[PDB]
């Protein structure tokens, strides 16, 4: 049961009388119970990487052998909780200890056993009914916004023998009991899952559905999909807060899991200060997003094992909520800092340094982590679909995408949103660069757009072409000036200016377009690209005539239409209905048509 | 408390470098403290670097020279290194290991604290908010420091970073629009510079607020290791218990990193990047992140690590990991130093990430952010024009270029250049900034809103 | 078709045996069942990294950039299980796919695979960005067995000359592109403009191809000649006159 400390050096401890110990199993070394992980075995010895400070650990100290590897404790109580990378509840530690520090070797249960939860069994279940892994045997009224579906652990099954009646219970109560091959398993409302073991699913379905954000540049030009894999440059003035806040508040994601994974102290305190105060509208009422968000937050002086395990704990919570048929946006704030924690652990283990110092397995670990995302046909009996969408940000030194973490991230992700401090300074909010950014999910979303927004795909292609054309013309204008351009190129420049200023740019702080419904986005782009087509037609069909039309004539005649296109931003879905917004954009199209027709 | 008699061993089994291996030890603690008497009666302290079975690898603070088997005695104190802390150690000088070197008495402890401390709970850490004025315009007006920020000074070898540090220690304080304190901790500081700090603070009378730790370059490197942890344990005591805003100035984290390298190699660990230990990130973070405001306690801890970048390579592990762990940078510039501008704080690459929280209405003044942005923009344009001036020649420049060059000259002469004993409140630094920005007419102050120009530009 | 799958989430050490399972099956089919087998080994980079992990755990001598010292031998044990045999009608054609890390052909994986294998078909980001498909960069591409797979009899007798001259003209076109960025268009001679036109039309017509388009070798060679006709005979210095006077005029 207990081993005994036999030696100590830094975090490494050597414990004797650990004959039955299992590799990578967790132990509580010392009288203070510093958590440690068995990294090597020999005879009856066990070598332990102790996550916490070993000062004071002495030979002969007990080493309690916890029968599990590093595992997240899943159940009611996650929503709104703030966890360390080792699942320690930071808010509960602070409340219970009345101390500004994490006590050394603290051992607070991750999910409170004190608090009672309202539990309603799956009405169909009976004594003797056949039940399997992933099956929902009850629902817990955890929050007004989230119903928590109590599921049998994967790798569990049998015939129900006792299922509790509806009522109030707690994480320590045996709520179900099942029997298989005479072996009887008694299940509470909590299941413990190794963080590095992929939670099973009946099938990992293709990711054919958008992950909305309400930011036009993100939704239209660079779409992500429920179950996607995305990257974000992390820098000072870039403004990753825009993406994080928009995903937390407006995304169609049912749940949000945010993983600090080794942040600066105050940079993490900012997140913990902001997220509780963010709010969302559900059923016409304003609710805090902490009713649907869970934070794995830890700073840079927290144990290195916590920083490395932060990503895995976050993705395992996200997988658990995916298994209930929810869509879970998991945002890792610095996979670069997770990778530095990985390199630090590798160096402490004295492993051979691979490319640029990072371990031999950084790429494999990033691949096996990002692979855990995706839309899935969930395990268990009630037919469900969930998803985990990983938005893992990465921090390239000074924009250098070459370092191993960034290179593997951009080779393993399928979207890259490429925020840009230069655009931030130019006041282009969001700061998405719309040249380095990309999204490889465009093909997968043809099936969806061709059904619900049939006209959006060519529209998007033309918008991207216009932006690329201005990117080309910017070089010419340097050499020979603006006036040298053909009228077609003037149309390109001015329509691109219109798009950049009044379509991609977006005043998120204001009520009218903080959230831009996709019908509004597609209508905006439809009107603008209709203007492009009409101006191009007018110039092209009259370049050969005596009455040659020019962008100057177009600007002077249709100043009203240009102003209305630029003002299209101001339509507010909360004051203008969807129908009214669509009707107004159709009216703008008709008026543009009339003006171009009268000119032509 | 330990009511238990201590055990003294003569069972020295080896002496290998700075390590005395003892055997037959009864239940050794890792990082226990040990007082060993040499054959001749000299006494040396030490720390149990490693433990295995009944063996104990006692790293002696002083050298092992003179230690022998069969006659050295070695008393195991039975506890890890705990530093005594009080308010009385505000206004004192201590060597790296807490022993007073100001010919005063040993600290009469209000409490005993483990120097390793515990990490501050992220859910209890509060965003830093207000400003800590340093008296140096090049940072108060352009890179100001928020209460709770960790903002290192990056300087090369031979630049006056120690002089800047002494000035900050003499002048720093709250903006005052008696609960302030400074913990100065020199690591690996040569005798001349240590004597300079000791004499400077005593003379210019800041000592009533300064707790000064000095680890001379010839003091043990293990004492260098425990110097910043004494400094920050005292800072935590004064800030989060005595409730006062503490500024911790850790001088020469490059020297601290060399001491860390020495101790790592003594453990016989294979080197990492550029020779430093692989865990230097976590160690530097354990030092730095003992900072920031906390929930419900008025006190706070602000840090100004000082780095001697070897070879001036910003990619060197020390400055690189410090940039990852801290929240800004204050560059000290060789070109300015040679030009004899003091303080030679190059404002262009220096950055303070939380300056936007440090400054503003009710903290420094309404116009601080605008003046800062405008001064930076004008300085950048001035450098650009000064480059263009050698290409096109002065007679070909426009009048705007002449205004920018005049601003550059007066900015480096009046705003940056300060003199070591000229203390400027942030209000005075801002008034100087406005005197400089009045070189231009309003229309070229394009980064200051009219709302602010109309109010502050005149006079 | 026979598929062996070892996904990113599957065990790392098992990627060491997956190629060997696939090639054992291919050898059963080719050298015992006399099938003509095409073997594809996807992400030999994710194989070499598994090999690196095992060698680092064993603490074996490293080669360059951490990989084991015997990676050449191991990748040879994999690749060399290809080719025909005497008296057996089967064959094994391998097309390993490996991701150059940081697009660097000198990285140990691509370097050793180039030493071991009989060529490399080079896929170029600088073409993928321009949206050319297939973005093959013939210039660093190579095929050691072309020298006998082409000629009179099999395929056509202008195949080698056309290939060599296309390579030469493409290289000179890249040189002209490189120099025009320095000197500009106004300082180029008409020969350099010929080379630039050849490069443009070569990437447009020869390389660029439909993902479902199957050009016979004869169509491809006719395109090659349509491109080489951009030049006068005297600038096609590789092709002998016996071939120029026969295929050039048409």
């Amino acid at each position: 049961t207990f081993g005994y400390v036999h030696g100590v050096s830094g975090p490494v401890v050597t414990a004797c009388d650990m004959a039955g110990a299992a590799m990578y199993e967790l132990v509580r070394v010392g009288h203070s119970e510093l958590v440690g992980e068995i990294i090597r075995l020999e005879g009856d010895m066990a070598t332990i990487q102790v996550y916490e400070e070993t000062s004071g650990v002495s030979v002969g100290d007990p080493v309690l052998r916890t029968g599990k590897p590093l595992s997240v404790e899943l159940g009611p109580g996650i929503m709104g909780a703030i966890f360390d990378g080792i699942q320690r509840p930071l808010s509960d530690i602070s409340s219970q200890t009345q101390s500004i520090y994490i006590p050394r070797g603290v051992n607070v249960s991750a999910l409170s056993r004190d608090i009672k939860w309202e539990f309603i069994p799956s009405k169909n279940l009976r004594v003797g009914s056949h039940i399997t892994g992933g099956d929902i045997y009850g629902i817990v009224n955890e929050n007004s916004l989230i119903k928590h579906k109590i599921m049998l652990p994967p790798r569990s099954r049998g015939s129900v023998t006792y299922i509790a009646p509806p009522g109030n219970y707690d994480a320590s109560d045996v709520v179900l009991e099942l029997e298989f091959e005479g072996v009887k398993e008694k299940l509470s409302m909590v299941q413990v899952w190794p963080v590095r073991q992929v939670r099973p699913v009946t099938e990992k379905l293709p990711a054919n559905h958008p992950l909305l954000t309400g930011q036009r540049v993100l939704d239209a030009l660079f779409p992500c999909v429920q179950g996607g894999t995305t990257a974000i440059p992390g820098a000072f003035g870039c403004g990753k807060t825009v993406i994080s806040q928009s995903l937390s508040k407006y995304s169609n994601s049912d749940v949000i899991i945010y993983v600090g994974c080794g942040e600066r102290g105050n940079e993490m305190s900012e997140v913990l200060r902001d997220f509780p105060e963010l709010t969302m509208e559900v059923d016409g009422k304003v609710e805090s997003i902490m009713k649907r968000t869970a934070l794995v937050a830890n700073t840079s002086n927290m144990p290195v094992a916590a920083r490395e395990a932060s990503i895995y704990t976050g993705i395992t919570l996200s997988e658990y909520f995916r298994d209930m048929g929810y869509h879970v946006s998991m945002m890792a704030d610095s996979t670069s800092r997770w990778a530095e924690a990985l390199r630090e652990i590798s160096g402490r283990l004295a492993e051979m340094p691979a490319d640029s110092g990072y371990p031999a397995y950084l790429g494999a670990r990033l691949a096996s982590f990002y692979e855990r995302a995706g839309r899935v046909k969930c395990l268990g009996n009630p037919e469900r679909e969930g998803s985990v969408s990983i938005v893992g940000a990465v921090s390239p030194p000074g924009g250098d995408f070459s370092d191993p973490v960034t290179s593997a991230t951009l080779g393993i992700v399928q979207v890259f949103w490429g925020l840009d401090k230069k655009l931030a300074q130019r006041k282009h909010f969001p700061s998405v660069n719309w040249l380095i950014s990309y999204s490889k999910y465009m093909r997968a979303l043809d099936e969806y757009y061709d059904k619900h927004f049939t006209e959006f795909v060519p529209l998007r292609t033309k918008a991207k072409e216009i932006l690329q054309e201005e990117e080309d013309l910017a070089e010419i204008v340097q050499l020979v000036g603006k006036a040298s351009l053909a009228e077609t190129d003037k149309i390109t420049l001015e329509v691109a200016k219109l798009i950049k200023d009044d379509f991609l740019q977006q005043n998120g702080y204001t009520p009218y377009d903080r959230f831009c419904p996709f019908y509004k986005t597609v209508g905006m782009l439809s009107n603008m690209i209709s203007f492009y087509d009409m101006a191009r037609r007018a110039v092209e069909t009259t370049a050969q005539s005596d009455n040659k039309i020019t962008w100057s004539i177009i600007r002077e005649h249709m100043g009203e239409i240009l102003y209305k296109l630029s003002s299209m931003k101001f339509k507010d879905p909360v004051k203008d209905g969807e129908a009214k917004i669509k009707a107004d954009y159709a009216q703008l199209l008709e008026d543009m048509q009339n003006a171009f027709r009268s000119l032509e | 408390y330990l009511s238990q008699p201590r055990l003294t061993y003569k069972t020295v089994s080896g002496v290998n470098g700075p390590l005395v291996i003892l055997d037959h030890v009864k239940f050794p603690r890792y990082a226990e403290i040990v007082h060993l008497t040499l054959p001749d009666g000299t006494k040396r302290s030490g720390q149990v670097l490693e433990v295995s079975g009944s063996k104990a690898v006692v790293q002696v603070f002083e050298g092992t020279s003179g230690i022998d088997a069969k006659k050295t005695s070695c008393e195991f104190t039975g506890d890890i290194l705990r530093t005594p802390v009080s308010e009385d150690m505000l206004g004192r000088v201590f060597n790296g290991s807490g022993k007073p070197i100001d010919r005063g008495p040993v600290v009469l402890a209000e409490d005993f604290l483990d120097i390793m401390g515990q990490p501050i709970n992220p859910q209890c850490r509060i965003y830093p908010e207000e400003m800590i004025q340093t008296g140096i315009s090049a940072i108060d007006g352009m890179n100001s420091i928020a209460r709770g920020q960790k903002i290192p000074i990056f300087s090369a070898a031979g630049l006056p970073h120690n002089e800047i540090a002494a000035q900050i220690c003499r002048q720093a304080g709250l903006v005052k629009k008696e609960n302030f304190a400074i913990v100065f901790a020199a690591m690996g500081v040569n005798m001349e510079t240590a004597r300079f700090f000791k004499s400077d603070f005593e003379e210019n009378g800041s000592m009533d607020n300064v707790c000064l730790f000095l680890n001379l370059a010839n003091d043990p490197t293990i004492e260098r290791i425990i110097t910043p942890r004494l400094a920050l344990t005292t800072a935590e005591f004064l800030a989060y218990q005595c409730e006062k805003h503490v500024l911790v100035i850790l001088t020469d984290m490059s020297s601290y990193a060399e001491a860390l390298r020495e101790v790592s190699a003594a453990r016989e660990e294979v080197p990492g990047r550029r020779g430093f230990p692989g865990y230097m990130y976590t160690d530097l973070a354990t030092i730095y992140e003992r900072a920031g405001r906390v929930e419900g306690r008025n006190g706070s801890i602000t840090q100004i690590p000082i780095l001697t970048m070897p070879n001036d390579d910003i990619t060197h592990p020390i400055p690189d990991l410090t940039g990852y762990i801290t929240e800004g940078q204050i560059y000290v510039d060789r070109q300015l130093h040679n030009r004899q501008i003091y303080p030679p704080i190059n404002v262009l690459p220096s950055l303070s990430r939380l300056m936007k929280s440090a400054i503003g209405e009710g903290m420094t003044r309404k116009d601080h952010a605008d003046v800062s942005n405008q001064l930076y923009a004008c300085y950048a344009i001035g450098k650009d024009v000064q480059a263009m001036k050698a290409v096109v020649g002065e007679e070909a420049l426009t009048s705007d270029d002449l205004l920018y060059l005049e601003f550059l000259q007066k900015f480096e002469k009046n705003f940056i250049t300060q003199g070591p004993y000229e203390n400027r409140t942030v209000y005075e630094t801002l008034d100087i900034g406005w005197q400089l920005l009045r070189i231009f007419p309003k229309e070229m102050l394009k980064r200051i809103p009219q709302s602010t120009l109309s109010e502050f530009y005149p006079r | 078709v026979c598929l062996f799958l070892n996904l990113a989430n599957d065990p790392t050490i098992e990627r060491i045996i997956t190629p060997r399972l696939a090639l054992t099956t291919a050898e059963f089919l080719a050298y015992q069942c006399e099938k003509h087998v095409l073997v594809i080994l996807t992400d030999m980079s994710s194989y070499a990294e598994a090999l690196r992990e095992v060698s680092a755990a064993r603490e074996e001598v490293p080669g360059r950039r951490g990989f084991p010292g015997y990676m050449y031998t191991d990748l040879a044990t994999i690749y060399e299980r290809a080719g025909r045999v005497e008296g057996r009608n089967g064959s094994i054609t391998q097309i390993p796919i490996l991701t150059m890390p940081n697009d660097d052909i000198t990285h140990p994986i691509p370097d050793l695979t180039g030493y071991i294998t009989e060529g490399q078909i080079y896929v170029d980001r600088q073409l993928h960005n321009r949206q050319i498909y297939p973005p093959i960069n013939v210039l660093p591409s190579l095929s050691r067995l072309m020298k006998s797979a082409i000629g009179e009899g099999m395929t056509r007798k202008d195949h080698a000359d056309v290939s060599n001259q296309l390579y030469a003209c493409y290289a000179i076109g890249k040189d002209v592109q490189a120099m025009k960025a320095v000197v500009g268009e106004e300082a180029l001679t008409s020969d350099d403009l010929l080379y630039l036109e050849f490069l443009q039309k070569f990437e447009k017509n020869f390389i660029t191809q439909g993902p479902y388009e199957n050009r016979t070798v004869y169509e491809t060679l006719d395109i090659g000649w349509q491109l080489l006709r951009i030049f006068p005979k005297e600038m096609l210095k590789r092709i002998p006159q016996s071939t120029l006077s026969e295929f050039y005029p048409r």
């Binding site: - | 294979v270 | 603490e59 001598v61």
Partner: peptide, 19 residues
């Protein structure tokens, strides 16, 4: 690093052989 790792391995082996 590899040389020093090998050397430490061999020192460990010698220490074991000393017993």
């Amino acid at each position: 690093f590899y040389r020093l790792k090998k050397i430490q391995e061999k020192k460990k082996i010698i220490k074991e052989k000393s017993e």
